[PDB]
Amino acid sequence: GPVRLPGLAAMRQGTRLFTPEQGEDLREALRRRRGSFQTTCEVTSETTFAAARRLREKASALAALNFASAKNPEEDLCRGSGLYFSLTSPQAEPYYAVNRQSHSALYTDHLIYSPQVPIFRDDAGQLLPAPVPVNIITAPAPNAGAVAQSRPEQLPQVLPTLRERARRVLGVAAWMEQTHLVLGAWGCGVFRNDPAGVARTFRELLEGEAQGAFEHVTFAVLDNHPQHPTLGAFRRELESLCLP
């Protein structure tokens, strides 16, 4: 029969959906991990997968945040990886079905956890000699641009939606015992969330509820714009977390 391609079945079968009603269990998992580590934080000018590939030898419990679409499984972490084979798993289907029927550009607090997704290619699109597996957390940031255009009365709700969903990202990471996280400018760019505000949201959590819950947090923010405004905003906001 068909050749079994390495690791793809285990990734798909191990994919996990987190639903809104699991918020409290996620909060408890994060609370138990709080204070475990003297967290190291850094803000780097790297792509998400370049950071994951650099760190994957340093740690196996490494997870990256995928800046995902809410409705369909400009580029997310499916590019260069096996992630689509996980996001289309049957257990992940409610993430797409519920977000579609919500009809809200704030979306819902569904998250997908994808274990040991193979990274197949580098930043330039060339094949890696050996794929590099990383865990991936998929959750959509609120689409501030779409809220502003089509439901402006929801615009004051973008910040609390972003914070509560960021809290659940960290909670999923703690729930799956992840020690290393690759975060970044989640929802910035096309969704038009402000970079300083996204950085400040993660700062609030990492200096509070999630303080010491992770060994290492990398904010991978590749920015080649002349004034580096996105990378600069993250560095300015997260300065106090980044001091060695």
Numbering used by the authors: 27 to 99, 111 to 281
Sentences from the paper on this structure:
Our study demonstrates that DrPARG is involved in catalyzing the breakdown of endogenous PAR and DNA repair in D. radiodurans. From observing the structural peculiarities of DrPARG, we show that although previously thought to be an obligate exo-glycohydrolase, bacterial PARG could exert both exo- and endo-glycohydrolase functions.
The crystal structure of DrPARG at 1.54 Å resolution reveals a typical macrodomain folding consisting of a seven-stranded β-sheet sandwiched between nine α-helices. Eleven residues (GGGFLGGAQAQ) from position 100 to 110 in the apo-form structure of DrPARG, belonging to the catalytic loop of glycohydrolase, that were not well defined in the electron density maps were omitted. The crystal structure of the space group P212121 of DrPARG contains one molecule per asymmetric unit.
